[PDB]
C-alpha cells in the first residue's frame, strides 16, 4: 500500500549480545535490510527512513525513496547508551507528519532490543495519540521479551483496539536469525 515508514532501529548496549547470530546489532542490520526492501517492492512510491533509539533519539535519515542510504546509515550505527522508547516513537511520529506526500499512510517499524523503562500509563497514553492520528507502529519484541511482553501488549492492544490488524507485536524467541521470522511475520504480509 501507499504508506510511509520509519524504522526505529536499536543501538543500545544490549545490541552487542550474540543472542541473535552473530550480534543483535548485526542481526537487526539484516532485518532492516529486509523490511526496507519489502516496503519498496510493495509500491515504488513507498518512503522509508531510519531513526535511532539511543540514549537520545537521532534521526539518521528521513523518508526517502532510496534503500541503499538506509543500509549506508545503519553500517556506522554503533552500540552505545540505553533505549529510550518513549521519545523514539514521538520523534519518528514527528518525521511521519512531515512526509513528502501527505497521501501516504503512517507506519513505524520498532526494533525493541532493550527493556522499556517506564510506567504502563506512559505507554498507554502514547498509543492513544498514535491511534488518534492513525499512526501504526509494528514493534518486534526480540531481546528481552521475558520482561517486555506485558508493556508492549498494552501498546498494541490500545493502539490496534478491537479488530485492529494495523500494528503487530511480533515476538521472536531467540534463535538463528530474527530476520528469518520476519518473512513469515505479518509485518511484510
Amino acid at each position: 500500500v501507499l504508506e510511509s515508514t520509519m524504522v526505529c532501529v536499536d543501538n543500545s548496549e544490549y545490541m552487542r549480545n550474540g543472542d541473535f547470530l552473530p550480534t543483535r546489532l548485526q542481526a537487526q542490520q539484516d532485518a532492516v535490510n529486509i523490511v526496507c526492501h519489502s516496503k519498496t517492492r510493495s509500491n515504488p512510491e513507498n518512503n522509508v527512513g531510519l531513526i535511532t533509539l539511543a540514549n537520545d533519539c537521532e534521526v539518521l535519515t528521513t523518508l526517502t525513496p532510496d534503500t541503499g542510504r538506509i543500509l549506508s546509515k545503519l553500517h556506522t550505527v554503533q552500540p552505545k547508551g540505553k533505549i529510550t522508547f518513549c521519545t523514539g516513537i514521538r520523534v519518528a511520529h514527528l518525521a511521519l507528519k512531515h512526509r513528502q506526500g501527505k497521501n501516504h499512510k503512517m507506519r513505524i517499524i520498532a526494533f525493541v532490543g532493550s527493556p522499556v523503562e517506564d510506567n504502563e500509563k506512559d505507554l498507554v497514553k502514547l498509543a492513544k495519540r498514535l491511534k488518534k492520528e492513525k499512526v501504526n507502529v509494528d514493534i518486534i519484541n526480540f531481546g528481552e521479551e521475558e520482561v517486555n511482553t506485558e508493556k508492549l501488549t498494552a501498546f498494541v492492544n490500545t493502539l490496534n483496539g478491537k479488530d485492529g490488524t494495523g500494528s503487530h507485536l511480533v515476538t521472536v524467541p531467540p534463535g538463528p536469525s530474527l530476520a528469518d521470522a520476519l518473512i513469515s511475520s505479518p509485518i511484510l504480509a
Binding site: 548496549e13 544490549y14 552487542r16 549480545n17 550474540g18 543472542d19 552500540p79 531467540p174
Partner: protein
C-alpha cells in the same frame, strides 16, 4: 576453557548459585547483560581480599573481551588490579589493558587515570605529570561530563596535594565535587574532602573568591563537626576580619598545613581586609587613609603601601596611592558574592536609576516634540 566456571559451579570461591546465573548468561550469550552480573560480582563482598579473582581474568573475561563495551571492560579490570599488589607488573597489565580498549576514548582516559593512581603511589611524580598533562588534554575533546571525569580529578587533585600546589588542588578538587552527586559520597569522605578544599583555598595562590566556596554544599557537612573552625576561619577570610583570624589562631594553628604557612595566610586576609574596606564604603567615600588600612589590617602604617601594591598588582582592587596625604584612592573592587538582602538593595538602586532615565525620556520627548520624528 570454561572449565573454571564449571570448576566454580560446584566448589567455587563465590556462591555456586551466583556462578550458575553467570553460567546461564554465557550459554544464552547475553554478553553485555553478564557484565552487570560480573560487575556485581567483581565487587564480591566475600572474597574481594582473596586472590582467587585474578584468575577470573585470564580464565573467564579474557575470552569474551573482544565484544564487551570498552568502558565497561576497564573499570572491571580496575578492581582486578586492586587484588594484585605488585606495582611493576600492574603497569604491563594496564599497558596491555590500555591497548585493547582503543576504540572508546573514555576507556583510554580510565586506563591512563588508573596507571597514574598506582604510579603516584610509587612516587614517580615526574611521569605522573606527563600522563596528567596528556589525559587532561584528551578529556577536553570528549563532550560533556562522563563517568571518567570524576576519577581523573580525584587523581589530579591527589597529585597536586603531594607536590604542594594548593592553588591547582583548589581548582581541580572543585571539578571533582562538580562531577559527582554530593549525596552519593560517604559522610566521612564528604567531611574530609570539604576540609582539604577549604584548607587549599586559604593556602592557594590567587584564591580570593571565598564567597563562592562558602556556599559549596560540601562545606555543609562541617557545620556540627569538630572541624567547624575551618568554616569560621573561612568566614573571617570572606569578611576580611584579621581580628577574627588571630582570635581563631588557637584553632587553625593546630593544623600543620595552616600553621606552617601562617605568614602567607596573614598576607591573604590582609588583602581581603583591604577589599572589605573598599567594598563597604560608598563610591563617594572610597578614599581610605593609611590609618584605616593600618588599623583594620593590623599592620604598621609603613607597611600599608606595600599591601596596596599586592592588591593592585594581583588585580583584587583598582586605584591609586597618595603617599603625601597618606590616602589610597580606591576606584574598583573585585565583585563578590551578595546575600539576598543586598540584592534587594541593588534592585532598589535600579528603581531610582530607572526613574531618572524615564524622567528625561519624557523630558526630551516633551521638549523636542515638534522636531521628533
Amino acid at each position: 576453557v570454561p572449565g573454571f566456571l564449571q570448576q566454580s559451579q560446584n566448589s567455587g570461591p563465590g556462591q555456586p548459585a551466583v556462578w550458575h546465573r553467570l553460567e546461564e548468561l554465557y550459554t544464552k550469550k547475553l554478553w553485555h547483560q553478564l557484565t552487570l552480573q560480573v560487575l556485581d560480582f567483581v565487587q564480591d563482598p566475600c572474597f574481594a581480599q582473596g586472590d582467587g579473582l585474578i584468575k577470573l581474568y585470564e580464565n573467564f573475561i579474557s575470552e569474551f573481551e573482544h565484544r564487551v563495551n570498552p568502558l565497561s571492560l576497564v573499570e572491571i579490570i580496575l578492581h582486578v588490579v586492586r587484588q594484585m599488589t605488585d606495582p611493576n607488573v600492574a603497569l604491563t597489565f594496564l599497558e596491555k589493558t590500555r591497548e585493547k580498549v582503543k576504540s572508546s576514548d573514555e576507556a583510554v582516559i580510565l586506563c591512563k587515570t588508573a596507571i597514574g593512581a598506582l604510579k603516584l603511589n610509587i612516587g614517580d611524580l615526574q611521569v605522573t605529570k606527563e600522563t596528567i598533562e596528556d589525559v587532561e588534554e584528551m578529556l577536553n575533546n570528549l563532550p560533556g561530563v562522563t563517568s571518567v571525569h570524576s576519577r581523573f580529578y580525584d587523581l589530579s587533585s591527589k597529585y597536586y596535594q603531594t607536590i604542594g600546589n594548593h592553588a591547582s588542588y583548589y581548582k581541580d578538587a572543585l571539578r571533582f565535587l562538580g562531577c559527582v552527586d554530593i549525596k552519593d559520597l560517604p559522610v566521612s569522605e564528604q567531611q574530609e574532602r570539604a576540609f582539604t578544599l577549604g584548607l587549599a583555598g586559604l593556602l592557594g595562590e590567587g584564591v580570593f573568591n571565598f564567597g563562592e566556596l562558602l556556599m559549596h554544599p560540601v562545606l555543609e557537612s562541617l557545620r556540627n563537626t569538630d572541624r567547624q573552625w575551618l568554616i569560621d576561619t573561612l568566614y573571617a577570610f570572606n569578611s576580611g576580619n584579621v581580628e577574627r583570624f588571630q582570635t581563631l589562631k588557637t584553632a587553625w594553628g593546630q593544623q600543620p598545613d595552616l600553621a606552617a604557612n601562617e605568614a602567607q595566610l596573614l598576607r591573604k586576609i590582609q588583602l581581603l581586609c583591604l577589599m572589605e574596606m573598599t567594598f563597604t564604603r560608598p563610591a563617594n567615600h572610597r578614599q581610605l587613609t593609611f590609618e584605616e588600612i593600618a588599623k583594620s589590617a593590623k599592620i604598621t602604617v609603613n607597611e600599608v603601601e606595600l599591601l596596596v601594591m599586592k592588591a593592585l598588582s594581583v588585580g583584587l582592587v583598582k586605584g591609586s596611592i597618595d603617599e603625601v596625604d597618606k590616602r589610597v584612592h580606591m576606584t574598583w573592587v573585585q565583585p563578590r558574592v551578595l546575600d539576598l538582602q543586598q540584592i534587594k538593595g541593588m534592585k532598589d538602586r535600579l528603581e531610582f536609576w530607572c526613574t531618572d532615565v524615564k524622567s528625561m525620556e519624557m523630558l526630551v520627548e516633551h521638549q523636542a516634540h515638534d522636531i521628533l520624528t
